[PDB]
């Protein structure tokens, strides 16, 4: 299976620059061109440029000539893109893709890389558990929540029980209170599960290597 693994998120000071990588596998790296797309908040895709892994050939969308700098490394089957003189406009998601199968389009994509250009300092989230508080408990579903508030920058990964619980989950989009982020996730489980079986919520905030596991108790 063709596989494109992109680097983690980035918070870059405006004026600075950033370099992201895109590791390819499951195919002959040099055989296919590596392409780069950028997508911004309000959602809207833009082609940046392609690169020929083989000879380092390069194709750039005029807009990004000088801003983007595609590079590749044959020995590691890794593609790189460097953005220079960042500004808030450069805050978006960048995908690397390829045309394996020659569909003459973008057949395979990476999972994306979120770049936030900002002079702000990273703030870890405050993870608060949300318990019912002496409520129903008789063969009737029960909703639990986890509040992740006051963090920066995006994103944050909330998970329920290391992932065992995927059904019933509802992770809401982050909102911007002040100049900080806040989101919350909920999970609906049968009265049997909790409070019997343990229910934890695991929050992870990459930007600050913050990993929390808050247990939901009554």
């Amino acid at each position: 299976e063709v596989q494109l693994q992109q680097s983690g998120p980035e918070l870059v000071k405006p004026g600075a620059s950033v370099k992201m990588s895109c590791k390819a596998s499951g195919y002959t790296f040099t055989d296919y061109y590596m392409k780069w797309v950028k997508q911004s908040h309000g959602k809207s895709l833009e082609w940046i440029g392609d690169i020929n892994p083989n000879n380092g050939g390069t194709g750039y969308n005029q807009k990004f000539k000088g801003k983007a700098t595609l590079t590749v490394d044959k020995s590691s089957s890794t593609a790189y893109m460097q953005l220079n003189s960042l500004t808030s406009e450069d805050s978006a998601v960048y995908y690397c893709a390829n045309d394996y199968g020659s569909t003459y389009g973008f057949a395979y994509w990476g999972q994306g890389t979120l770049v936030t250009v900002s002079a702000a300092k990273t703030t870890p989230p405050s993870v608060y558990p949300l318990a019912p508080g002496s409520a129903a408990q008789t063969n009737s579903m029960v909703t639990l929540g986890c509040l992740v508030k006051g963090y920066f920058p995006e994103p944050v990964t909330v998970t329920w029980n290391s992932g065992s619980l995927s059904s019933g989950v509802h992770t809401f989009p982050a909102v911007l209170q002040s100049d900080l982020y806040t989101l919350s996730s909920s999970v609906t489980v049968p009265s049997s599960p909790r409070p019997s079986e343990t229910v934890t919520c695991n929050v992870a905030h990459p930007a600050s290597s913050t990993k929390v596991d808050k247990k939901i108790v009554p």
């Binding site: 973008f106 508080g133 809401f172």
Partner: protein
């Protein structure tokens, strides 16, 4: 640069029905008898998914429900029959010339039967209060349509500011929406009131759905 205009921008379609999205290239995108227009599907939270390439080719693994057509400057994507897993934003993209261009996108919403939200209210955790903060959270899950209201009442009276609502995108399994509202006060404001109510209203109507708790 070539401009790709997609139409409509938004479209709601009941399950089993047909969905037709248009794409109009400003120039022609034909080259040696082949129209180079591709279509991508993008569900919130993930990279686009190539559906149909070179105008009418359905990518291997894509449900036959999808089908592209058109040529020259006018292209169309057809979905039949519509399913719950189709709610997403769709894009046409030209591969004819530099620079490759994407369309303005089309959000596809699924129509279904009105459904009441499942409200659940939560008081501030001890942890949070200790740090002088009090956030009351209200979850309104799986309702429909997306148009819903949320009124917060403290000790009977309506609380205006300090609220933070967040909607979920239409579910892929049941085509429903969910929303989270959070009234954020200070531990002082919180401790000086007893009853906290969260109530939902559907557009107009008059019969709300409330949930509340007392600080004891």
């Amino acid at each position: 640069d070539m401009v790709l205009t997609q139409s409509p921008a938004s479209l709601a379609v009941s399950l089993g029905q047909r969905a037709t999205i248009s794409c109009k290239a400003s120039q022609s995108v034909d080259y040696d008898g082949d129209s180079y227009m591709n279509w991508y599907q993008q569900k919130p939270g993930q990279p686009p998914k190539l559906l149909i390439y070179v105008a009418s080719n359905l990518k291997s693994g894509i449900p036959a429900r999808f089908s592209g057509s058109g040529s020259g400057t006018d292209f169309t994507l057809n979905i039949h029959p519509v399913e719950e897993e189709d709610a997403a934003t769709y894009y046409c993209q030209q591969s004819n010339e530099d620079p490759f261009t994407f369309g303005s996108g089309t959000k596809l919403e699924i129509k279904r039967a009105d459904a009441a939200p499942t409200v659940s209210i939560f008081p501030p955790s001890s942890e949070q209060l200790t740090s002088g903060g009090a956030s009351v959270v209200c979850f309104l899950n799986n309702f429909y349509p997306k148009d819903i209201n949320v009124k917060w009442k403290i000790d009977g009276s309506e609380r205006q500011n300090g609220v933070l609502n967040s909607w979920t995108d239409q579910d892929s399994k049941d085509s429903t929406y969910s929303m989270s509202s959070t009234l954020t006060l200070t531990k002082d404001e919180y401790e000086r009131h007893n009853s906290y109510t969260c109530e939902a209203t559907h557009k107009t109507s008059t019969s709300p759905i409330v949930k509340s708790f007392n600080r004891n």
